Amino acid sequence: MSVIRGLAAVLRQSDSDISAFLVTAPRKYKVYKIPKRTTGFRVIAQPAKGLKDIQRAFVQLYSLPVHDASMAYMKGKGIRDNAAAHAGNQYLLKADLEDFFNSITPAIFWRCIEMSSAQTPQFEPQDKLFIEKILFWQPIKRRKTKLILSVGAPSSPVISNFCMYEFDNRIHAACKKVEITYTRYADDLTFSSNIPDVLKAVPSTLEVLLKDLFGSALRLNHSKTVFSSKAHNRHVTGITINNEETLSLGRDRKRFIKHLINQYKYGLLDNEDKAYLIGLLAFASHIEPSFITRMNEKYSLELMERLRGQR
Amino acid sequence: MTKQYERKAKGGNLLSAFELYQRNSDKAPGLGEMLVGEWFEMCRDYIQDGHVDESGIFRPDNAFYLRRLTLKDFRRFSLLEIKLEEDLTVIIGNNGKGKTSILYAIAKTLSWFVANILKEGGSGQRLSEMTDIKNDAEDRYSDVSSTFFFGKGLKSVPIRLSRSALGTAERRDSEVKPAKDLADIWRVINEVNTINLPTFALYNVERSQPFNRNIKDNTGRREERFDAYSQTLGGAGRFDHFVEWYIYLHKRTVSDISSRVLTESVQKSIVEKAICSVVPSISNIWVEMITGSDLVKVTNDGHDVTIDQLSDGQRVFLSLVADLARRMVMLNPLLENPLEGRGIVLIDQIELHLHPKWQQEVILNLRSAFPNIQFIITTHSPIVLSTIEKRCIREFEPNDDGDQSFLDSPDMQTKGSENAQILEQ
Amino acid sequence: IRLSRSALGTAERRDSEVKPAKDLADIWRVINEVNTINLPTFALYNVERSQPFNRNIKDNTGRREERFDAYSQTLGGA
Amino acid sequence: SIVEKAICSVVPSISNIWVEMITGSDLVKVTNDGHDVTIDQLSDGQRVFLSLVADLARRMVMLNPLLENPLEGRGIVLIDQIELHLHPKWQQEVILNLRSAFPNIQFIITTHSPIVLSTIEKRCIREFEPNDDGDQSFLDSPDMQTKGSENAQILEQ
RNA sequence: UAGUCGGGUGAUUAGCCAGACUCUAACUUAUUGAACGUAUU
Ligand SMILES: Nc1ncnc2c1ncn2[C@@H]1O[C@H](COP(=O)(O)OP(=O)(O)O)[C@@H](O)[C@H]1O
C-alpha cells in the first residue's frame, strides 16, 4: 500500500492503526495565538503529537526537489547565507508573497508534482488521498474541501519549498542573465544587482510568472514591494547590509547590546535579561564576529568571559 | 510578552508603549497605574513633544504624513505607485488621467483614521464595487494600499482598502487594523489627557455650491470638540457649520466681560487672522447682531459686504480656509498657534474660480498659514506650478493608458519660471 | 435588551445587547413563515395623534392588504 | 444622430456615445480615449462639458424641428467660466468647437484664462480695469489683439 | 541640505565626536514548528 507501508515501517506501528489515524488527521490541529512584536496576534495551528510524528516520518521518507536559491528550512543554510548572497551589491528589490503558507492547497501541491522539471517521487493513486490527510490542515470544521498548509507543522516547510521549485528555477534562470542574484527565505524574495534600473522590471516578471504557474492562488504583496539602495537602509531578512558591503546587526541593535553589557557590568541586569543578552550575543557572534572582538576591547575580556560561556 | 514590549518601548516604539500602558492600566489596583507614568507618559510625550524652530513655527518631534500610495486595478490604473512628499505634493496631467481618483482613494483611506478617532472600532468609507474596479481588469477586484509615517517610533502604518466587483463569488478583505491601532492610541491618550489631534480634510469639486444661511436646527453642537471630524472628508467643507461656530464664538465673547481670559476670544481672533491673511480680497470679518438675524460680514476691497454677496471664487476659497482654520483650532487646543497642528489636507483643483492674480499666491498663503499640514493638491495651471518646487510635482505622461508604474517629477525646475515655459515643457 | 450609545471620542464604545430580542423575534418570524401564527402588536400614540384628516386619500392600492403592513409606521407616534 | 455628432465633435475625449442594456436597465455609455466607461465614471472636466453640450444640443433639437441642422438655430447662451474644470490643452479649442457646433447662437461668456482669450478676437472682449470701484460706465475691449498671441503677452498686457 | 551607514566616547536603547554613501525608492518582522547560532550534553 506504498505510503502507509513505509510509514508503518518507519514508525513501528501497524498499517491499520495509521490508516485509522489518517481519517480526521487534517482536523487534528491545536490553534493558538502568539504575540506580535508591535501589536496584535498571529494565529498558528500546530498538529497533535501523533500527526507531527507521521509528518516527520513522511518528510524524511520522501525527498522533494528544492532549489539552491531557497535559504529557509534548509540544512546548513540560514539567515546569514541569505543576507550574504546580497552583501556585495548596491540596489535591491525585497518582495513578499501574499499569505504564502495558507495559499498552498492540495490542488497546488498535486499540480506542482506533475510538472516538476526534476525528479519527483512516484505516488500511487491509492495513497494520494492519504497524502492530503498527512500534510494539509482543515481549518473550518463544517467545510471539508478547504485544505491549506499551516505554518507550525513539521511537513509544511519542505512542502512549501518544493511547491516553488519551478518558480525558483525559472526566476533564477531569467534573473541571472540580467546580472541579478535571487534568493527566497520561503516568503520573502530578495533581488539585488550592481546594474541600475534593471530591478524595476522584476515585479512584473514575478507577477506574470506567478499567474503562469499558480494562477490566481498565489500572488505578490504589492504593499511589501520595496526598492532600496546604498542611499537608504538595507537589510535582508533581519541582517543589515552596511555601506561597506558587510553583514551587520545595525547600529541600533549594537547600541542596545552595548547598553545591556554596561548594565551587566554594574550588576543592574537580572537573570532573564542576562539570559536574553547571552542569547543575543550568541546570535551576534554568528552574524557579526567582529562585534564580539569590539566588545572585548570596550568592556574588557574578563567581563565578557564572566557573562558568556565558560567551561 | 511583557519584556519584549518593554525593550521595544524604551527604545522608542509607540505601539509597544501603548500596549504596555493598556495592559498595566487593566489592573486598576494591580501592577501598572492610571497614567502608567512610564508608559502613558511616554505615549503622550511622543504625541505631544515638539520645539519651535528658528522661524518661530512649532514643529512636532514625530510628524504625521502619508508616504506612499499603491493603486491596483483602481479606476484607470492597472498598478500605480506614488511617493508623496512630506510637505506638499502637486499632481498634474490632462483631463481624465486620474488625479481626482488619487485624491478620492487617499480620502477613503483617511476616513478610517477619522472614524476610529471618533469611535472605537468605527467603520470608515469603502471602495465602490460598481465604479471603482477597473472596467477591463481580469481579476475583478481593486486595491488601494497606503503607508503612513508617524515618527521614528512608528515608521510604517500600512492600510489597504479592497473591494471585489459586483457579482463576484470571491470577495477581497481590507487590511485596516494598523489604522485602527493608531487611532485607538490617539483616542485613548486623548481621553486620559487632552492632546492635539490630526486634521484630515478633503476639498473636492463638490464644494462651491451656493451658500444660504439655511442651517438653524442643524443637529450636532458645533462647540463640541469632535465636531471638527463631521463631514470632514465629504468634499464640501461645512461652511454653514463654520458660520454657526463663528456666531457662537461672537456671542460668547460679547456676553463675557485660567487667567480670567476667554479662550473663545482667542479662537475667534486666530480664525479671523487666518482668514484675513490667506484670502486676498477679504480684509476683516465680524458678526453683526443688530438687524436681529445673525449675519457674517467681511470687508471686500474696502467695502463692508455680507457673506452671501461674495463672488464665486472669494466665497469658495473663504469656505475652504475658514473650514480648515476652524477644524485646526478645535483639534489643537494646547498649541500656541493651532494652525501649526499636523494633518493631511486634500485640495482638488486649488485654482478653482481663481483669477491668475490669485493663483500666484494661493499656495504660499496656504503653506504659511498651515506649515505642518501635508497638502496633496491637483491643479490645471502653469501659474500655480511657477510657485511650487519641482520635487513636489507628480506629472502624468501625455500618452499614458493607465499602465504606468510610478509617477515622476518633471525635468524642468518650475519654481520662479515663466508661465510660457512651464506651459510648453 | 439594552440600547446603548456613547459620546464621540470616548476611549471605549458602548454597544447594544439586542440579541435576545432578536432571537425571540426570529422565533416569531420563522414559525410564522412555516405556519401562520398570531403576532404581537406594538403601537405608539403620541400627541401628534391630533392631526387634521386629509379627506381625499392616496389610492396607493396593493400594500394596505398585505399582512405585514400592520407594522408600517406603527411606532411613529401618529 | 444629430445629438451624437454634436457631443462627439465638441468634447475632445468623447468618441462615441450610445445606450446599452445592462441587467435589464438602460444606461448611457461613452468612449473616453478608446475605453468604454459610463457617464458616472467621467471626470469633473469631461462630465461638466458633456452635460453642457448635450443639454444645449437637446434644447436646439427640440426647439428647431424645421431645420436640416437644428444646431444652426437662433438663441442666446450665457456661460460662466467657460474654462471650468478644463485642462489648458482643452482651452485652446473650447471656443472653436462651440462656435462651429452652434453657429447662429450668440455666446456671452466669462473667462479667467489667457489660453481661451488667445482663440478669441480682441473686438469680442470686454475687460474690467484692475482699478475699478464701480463708478466706470463702459466695458471696453483690450488694446492688444489677443487672437493668435503668446500666452505671456496676453497674461501681461 | 536632507536621509542613510556606523567606528568611538557615553551608569549606555538617549545624547555627542570622527568618517562614509546617495538606482525617483526599507518600513526590522514570528512560536512551542522548520532550519541556524549558543548552552547543557
Ligand atoms: N472603473 C473604471 N474603469 C476604467 N476607467 C475608469 C474607471 N473609472 C474611471 N475611469 C477613467 O478614469 C478617469 C477619471 O478621471 P479623474 O480621475 O477625475 O481625472 P482628473 O483629475 O484628470 O479629471 C476618466 O478618464 C475615466 O474614463
Short mmCIF file of N, CA, C and O (backbone and C1' of nucleotides) in Angstrom, two decimals, chain E residues 1 4-5 7 10-11 16 20 22-23 26-28 30-32 36-37 39:
data_model
loop_
_atom_site.label_atom_id
_atom_site.label_comp_id
_atom_site.label_asym_id
_atom_site.label_seq_id
_atom_site.Cartn_x
_atom_site.Cartn_y
_atom_site.Cartn_z
P U E 1 25.59 71.64 2.89
"O5'" U E 1 24.49 71.95 4.01
"C5'" U E 1 23.78 70.90 4.65
"C4'" U E 1 22.31 70.96 4.31
"C3'" U E 1 21.42 69.88 4.93
"O3'" U E 1 21.04 70.22 6.26
"C1'" U E 1 20.92 70.17 2.61
P U E 4 17.14 58.12 8.55
"O5'" U E 4 18.23 57.17 7.88
"C5'" U E 4 17.85 56.18 6.95
"C4'" U E 4 19.03 55.70 6.14
"C3'" U E 4 20.18 55.10 6.94
"O3'" U E 4 19.93 53.75 7.32
"C1'" U E 4 21.04 56.63 5.37
P C E 5 20.57 53.17 8.68
"O5'" C E 5 22.09 52.92 8.29
"C5'" C E 5 22.44 51.96 7.31
"C4'" C E 5 23.92 51.98 7.06
"C3'" C E 5 24.78 51.77 8.30
"O3'" C E 5 24.95 50.40 8.63
"C1'" C E 5 25.59 53.62 7.06
P G E 7 30.66 49.57 13.22
"O5'" G E 7 32.14 50.09 13.01
"C5'" G E 7 33.15 49.79 13.94
"C4'" G E 7 34.04 50.98 14.20
"C3'" G E 7 34.01 51.54 15.61
"O3'" G E 7 34.72 50.75 16.55
"C1'" G E 7 33.91 53.31 14.08
P G E 10 33.76 56.69 28.21
"O5'" G E 10 32.26 57.18 28.03
"C5'" G E 10 31.88 58.53 28.31
"C4'" G E 10 30.39 58.69 28.20
"C3'" G E 10 29.58 57.73 29.04
"O3'" G E 10 29.46 58.17 30.39
"C1'" G E 10 28.72 57.76 26.84
P A E 11 29.69 57.16 31.61
"O5'" A E 11 28.55 56.08 31.41
"C5'" A E 11 28.28 55.11 32.42
"C4'" A E 11 26.81 54.77 32.45
"C3'" A E 11 25.89 55.95 32.72
"O3'" A E 11 24.65 55.78 32.03
"C1'" A E 11 25.87 54.41 34.57
P C E 16 22.81 66.06 20.58
"O5'" C E 16 24.28 66.67 20.52
"C5'" C E 16 25.29 66.03 19.76
"C4'" C E 16 26.52 65.76 20.58
"C3'" C E 16 27.78 65.48 19.77
"O3'" C E 16 28.41 66.66 19.33
"C1'" C E 16 27.54 63.83 21.45
P A E 20 35.23 61.13 4.68
"O5'" A E 20 34.18 60.04 4.17
"C5'" A E 20 34.62 58.76 3.75
"C4'" A E 20 33.47 57.78 3.67
"C3'" A E 20 32.40 58.08 2.64
"O3'" A E 20 32.78 57.68 1.33
"C1'" A E 20 31.39 57.45 4.68
P U E 22 27.49 56.90 -3.77
"O5'" U E 22 25.95 57.07 -3.44
"C5'" U E 22 25.04 56.00 -3.59
"C4'" U E 22 23.65 56.49 -3.34
"C3'" U E 22 23.09 57.38 -4.45
"O3'" U E 22 21.71 57.07 -4.69
"C1'" U E 22 23.15 58.59 -2.40
P C E 23 21.36 55.80 -5.62
"O5'" C E 23 19.82 55.97 -6.00
"C5'" C E 23 19.42 56.51 -7.25
"C4'" C E 23 19.40 55.48 -8.36
"C3'" C E 23 18.10 55.32 -9.14
"O3'" C E 23 17.90 56.35 -10.10
"C1'" C E 23 19.10 53.20 -8.72
P A E 26 12.80 54.22 0.71
"O5'" A E 26 13.69 52.91 0.68
"C5'" A E 26 14.36 52.46 1.84
"C4'" A E 26 13.38 51.92 2.84
"C3'" A E 26 13.78 52.07 4.31
"O3'" A E 26 12.62 52.38 5.08
"C1'" A E 26 13.35 49.80 3.82
P C E 27 12.64 53.60 6.13
"O5'" C E 27 11.78 53.05 7.36
"C5'" C E 27 11.95 51.72 7.82
"C4'" C E 27 10.64 51.06 8.16
"C3'" C E 27 10.70 49.54 8.29
"O3'" C E 27 9.77 49.10 9.29
"C1'" C E 27 9.20 50.12 6.56
P U E 28 10.14 49.22 10.85
"O5'" U E 28 10.24 47.71 11.35
"C5'" U E 28 10.38 46.64 10.43
"C4'" U E 28 11.11 45.46 11.03
"C3'" U E 28 11.38 45.54 12.53
"O3'" U E 28 11.33 44.23 13.09
"C1'" U E 28 13.42 45.32 11.38
P A E 30 5.85 39.60 13.91
"O5'" A E 30 6.65 38.54 14.78
"C5'" A E 30 6.01 37.80 15.81
"C4'" A E 30 6.54 36.39 15.89
"C3'" A E 30 8.06 36.26 15.92
"O3'" A E 30 8.42 35.12 16.69
"C1'" A E 30 7.22 35.16 14.00
P U E 31 8.80 35.27 18.24
"O5'" U E 31 8.30 33.91 18.89
"C5'" U E 31 7.09 33.31 18.44
"C4'" U E 31 6.76 32.05 19.20
"C3'" U E 31 7.93 31.09 19.41
"O3'" U E 31 7.74 30.37 20.64
"C1'" U E 31 6.27 30.03 18.10
P U E 32 8.98 29.71 21.43
"O5'" U E 32 8.46 28.25 21.77
"C5'" U E 32 9.30 27.11 21.61
"C4'" U E 32 8.50 25.84 21.49
"C3'" U E 32 8.25 25.36 20.06
"O3'" U E 32 8.18 23.94 20.06
"C1'" U E 32 6.19 25.80 21.11
P C E 36 20.46 23.19 10.82
"O5'" C E 36 20.81 24.71 11.12
"C5'" C E 36 21.41 25.54 10.14
"C4'" C E 36 21.66 26.93 10.64
"C3'" C E 36 22.50 27.05 11.90
"O3'" C E 36 23.89 26.89 11.65
"C1'" C E 36 20.62 28.46 12.09
P G E 37 24.82 26.14 12.73
"O5'" G E 37 24.96 27.21 13.90
"C5'" G E 37 25.55 28.47 13.63
"C4'" G E 37 25.39 29.43 14.77
"C3'" G E 37 25.78 28.93 16.15
"O3'" G E 37 27.19 28.85 16.35
"C1'" G E 37 23.77 30.14 16.31
P A E 39 28.69 26.88 23.00
"O5'" A E 39 27.72 26.67 24.24
"C5'" A E 39 27.72 27.59 25.32
"C4'" A E 39 26.64 27.27 26.31
"C3'" A E 39 26.65 25.85 26.85
"O3'" A E 39 27.59 25.66 27.89
"C1'" A E 39 24.47 26.39 26.16
#
